[PDB]
RNA sequence: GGAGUGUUU
């Protein structure tokens, strides 16, 4: 439970394909870099100010300290030079005036670039050296741009609610098999528009003019406004940070003011701003922003506050994201060209600081040979046992029937939309069409619905659902019609998943009025699996040799609430395959610590899944294949330590000598690696992306460890994100080919569509399970996420 | 229905 295994070999399966990646080769000298620590006082200043402190410091003490050397600075404590500063072992205390700062500089260590080169050829990598290079490369942009994480942005594209989309770029230095790579990609994120809070109030509460609201805010408006502006920074027309919005208006909101006599008296914010600042508040009927430490009693009228510029958005409305998707999505060729322009304007080979450290960057994207793996055949059932062959990551069910289709004889309909909007003739036409498609799909819905009624309100779900279970023997499914985004869906799922063991399929009102065969087909995919059916399976004989013994595939993911909201738990989910196909999955879900990435109760969850596997297959797994999603590189050792041990603990707690081989694989979508076709003829579709199944385990991958990118999906729009897979542990001694082929085939087992998806089904299912828990809304939280015994064994999350 | 696409008061 310690160190990731070395790369066992290089893959050779699949037809070769010429690719380019947004990785640019770095030529780096074998010199020593000199690392100096900077403890400046005050020590809590923003990184920008720190950079300014250091900026003036270098120039101010050019004569006696720095000379002609051009140091780089990380914004905190670390400063690097290509040559040693004439300060030896001893610390030097300096003054910096901008307003006064006590800056101390002391040498710490020599960063050996020679030691890095050798790490890039076995000797299995020092984090410190890579970090230092990163500081060198991003020193100038950190002064020339607004740094946001590993990205850089400038002000130019609204989204609504005071939001704007800024265009910038991501930059990071990365290790590879022989050289350092510079990873560059275009970036885009939502920022709050810098504007007066009064106008923020308008755009949030949809006012064309603040004058429309001549009166104090309703309890509804204030709550909505509080939600948006909380945690955001503001400035005086001095920078503050909003922690709440007052219930009372500025004309009546008071605070204790100490008069010069010594006695303290309550004074209104409005009266204070009149006496102290000679300002008659224009909108004294509006509330104040509570900034500071709550205990500060610091209230600011809205009309004297502006949203500070450069604030990144941390949940977007569905209209905002749609607009954001629209403006940010662009074809792979177009994105590739944008990155080229990015490199051109960056002009690294003239950057004074990277020239100081003798660094050079290649202007062309790295050439990589990819491999297009062969897709698996998909076996269907019914009369003619049709075999589907994925083409460009896609297949269909035409002249095919489910492997094991569920005969639906008893089923009901509930409609939570107006009877005028979704009339009886809609239901009749919808039902008739649904039966025909289901008939052709091998999931024959025999006969009309045994029940059909109208309703409205989330309070109607349960008692209606209370009825149906008792009155109709063998009730299989209850179709639910919903009028757009109505917070009743969450209640349909609560009752259907938790209180009663009842399968429920929701469908929007619009998809009932106007039905299409394709929509109905996809609806049948979800229904069949929800009732325990098997839509299809991998062609058994086309499976990798891992299936020669009983094996269980696990998918794990944890979803976090908005940072800083607090008091909201993270949701961990683990799913496990329950047959040899593999098709059916059982789910486990837990609430845990806010923003905790480690799955706390993993041992218990894995135990439950092993038990169910044995009950379903009468076999104990000889191998556990664990696909872990939602983990960054900086967390690998922490996650691997706790979670590999937890998996082991589950096995031991089950039976003393039970030691199946564990393969631990982290799957990552959140990265800035992009692959492009070198040959135009290899571009797929209008988006011109790489084909489904393209694999790369060379050139841009880890120099010693077992990792690969796999674009398992076809790109519909924008530029495809190839998934990255990093093997943190492997008792089973997979070859490169078998593991890559295995991952790829698992991307074809996802039951909600006849498409190869971007991550293996179990990892995807884990996401769905965790997301379903969000709709389920400390012991109560754990109870509210707990699923019915009936539902416990089903795929309700589909 | 679905996948993919952007994240001092």
UniProtKB/Swiss-Prot annotation:
Binding site for a divalent metal cation: 557, 629, 767
Reactions performed catalytically: Endonucleolytic cleavage to 5'-phosphomonoester
Record flagged with keyword Cell inner membrane: no
Gene Ontology MF: a single term: endoribonuclease activity, cleaving siRNA-paired mRNA
Location in or out of the cell: Cytoplasm, P-body; Nucleus
Reported effect, residue 430 to W: No effect on binding to the 7-methylguanosine cap of mRNA or inhibition of translation
Domain PAZ intervals: 196-309
Sequence similarity: Belongs to the argonaute family. Ago subfamily.
Protein name: Protein argonaute-2
Gene label: AGO2
């Amino acid at each position: 439970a310690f160190k990731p295994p070395p790369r066992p070999d290089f893959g050779t399966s699949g037809r070769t394909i010429k690719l380019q990646a947004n990785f640019f080769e770095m030529d780096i000298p074998k010199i020593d870099i000199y690392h100096y620590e900077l403890d400046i006082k005050p020590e809590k200043c923003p990184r920008r100010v720190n950079r300014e402190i250091v900026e003036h410091m270098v120039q101010h003490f050019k004569t006696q300290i720095f000379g002609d050397r051009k140091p780089v600075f990380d914004g905190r404590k670390n400063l690097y030079t290509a040559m040693p500063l004439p300060i030896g072992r001893d610390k030097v205390e300096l003054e910096v005036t901008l307003r006064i700062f006590k800056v101390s500089i002391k040498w710490v260590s020599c960063v050996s670039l020679q030691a890095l080169h050798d790490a890039l050829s076995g000797r299995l990598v020092p984090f410190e050296t890579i970090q230092a290079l990163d500081v060198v490369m991003r020193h100038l942009p950190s002064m020339r741009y607004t740094p946001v994480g590993r990205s850089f942005f400038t002000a130019s594209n609204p989204l609504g609610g005071g939001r704007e989309v800024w265009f910038g770029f991501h930059q990071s230095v990365r290790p590879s098999l022989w050289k350092m790579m510079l990873n560059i990609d275009v970036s885009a994120t939502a920022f709050y528009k810098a504007q007066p809070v009064i106008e923020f109030v308008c755009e949030v509460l949809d006012f064309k003019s603040i004058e429309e609201q001549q009166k104090p805010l309703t309890d509804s408006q204030r709550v909505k406004f509080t939600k948006e502006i909380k945690g955001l920074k503001v400035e005086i027309t001095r920078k503050y940070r909003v922690c709440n919005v007052t219930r009372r208006p500025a004309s009546h909101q008071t605070f204790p003011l100490q008069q010069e006599s010594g006695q303290t008296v309550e004074c209104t914010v409005a009266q204070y701003f009149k006496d102290r600042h000679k300002l008659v508040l224009r909108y004294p009927h509006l509330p104040c922003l509570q900034v500071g430490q709550e205990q500060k009693h610091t209230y600011l009228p809205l009309e004297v506050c502006n949203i500070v510029a450069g604030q990144r958005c941390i949940k977007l409305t569905d209209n905002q994201t749609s607009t954001m998707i629209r403006a940010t999505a662009r074809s792979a060729p177009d994105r590739q060209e944008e990155i080229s322009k990015l490199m051109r304007s960056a002009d690294f080979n003239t950057d004074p600081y990277v020239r100081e450290f003798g660094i050079m960057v290649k202007d062309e994207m790295t050439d990589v040979t990819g491999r297009v793996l062969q897709p698996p055949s998909i076996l269907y059932g019914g009369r003619n046992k049709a075999i589907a062959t994925p083409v460009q990551g896609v297949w269909d069910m035409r002249n095919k029937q489910f492997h094991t289709g569920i005969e639906i004889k008893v089923w009901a309909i509930a409609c939570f939309a107006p009877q005028r909007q979704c009339t009886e003739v809609h239901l009749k036409s919808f039902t008739e069409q649904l039966r025909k498609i289901s008939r052709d799909a091998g999931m024959p819905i025999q006969g009309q619905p045994c029940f059909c009624k109208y309703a409205q309100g989330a309070d109607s779900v349960e008692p209606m659902f209370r009825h149906l279970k008792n009155t109709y023997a063998g009730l299989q499914l209850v179709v639910v019609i919903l009028p757009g985004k109505t917070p009743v869906y969450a209640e349909v799922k609560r009752v259907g998943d938790t209180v009663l063991g009842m399968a429920t399929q929701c469908v929007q009102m619009k998809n009932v009025q106007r039905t299409t065969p394709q929509t109905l087909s996809n609806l049948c995919l979800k229904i069949n699996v929800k009732l325990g059916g098997v839509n299809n399976i991998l062609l058994p004989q086309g499976r990798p040799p891992v299936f020669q013994q009983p094996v269980i595939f696990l998918g794990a993911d944890v979803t976090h609430p908005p940072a800083g909201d607090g008091k909201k738990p993270s949701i961990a989910a683990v799913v496990g395959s329950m047959d040899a196909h593999p098709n059916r999955y059982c789910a486990t879900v837990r609430v845990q610590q806010h923003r905790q990435e480690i799955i706390q109760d993993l041992a218990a969850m894995v135990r439950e899944l092993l038990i169910q596997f044995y009950k379903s297959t009468r076999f104990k797994p000889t191998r556990i294949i664990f696909y872990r999603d939602g983990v960054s590189e900086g967390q690998f050792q922490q996650v691997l330590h706790h979670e590999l041990l937890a998996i082991r603990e589950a096995c031991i707690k089950l039976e003393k000598d039970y030691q199946p081989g564990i393969t631990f694989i982290v799957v990552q979508k959140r990265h800035h690696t992009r692959l492009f076709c070198t040959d135009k003829n290899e571009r797929v579709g209008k988006s011109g992306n790489i084909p489904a199944g393209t694999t790369v385990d060379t050139k841009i991958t880890h120099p010693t460890e077992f990792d690969f990118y796999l674009c398992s999906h076809a790109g519909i729009q924008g530029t495809s994100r190839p998934s990255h897979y990093h093997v943190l542990w492997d008792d089973n001694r997979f070859s490169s080919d078998e593991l890559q082929i295995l991952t790829y085939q698992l991307c074809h087992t996802y039951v909600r569509c006849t498409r190869s998806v971007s991550i293996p089904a179990p990892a995807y299912y884990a996401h769905l399970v965790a997301f379903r828990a969000r709709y389920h809304l400390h012991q109560a939280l754990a109870k509210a996420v707990q699923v019915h015994q009936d539902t416990l064994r089903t795929m309700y999350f589909a």
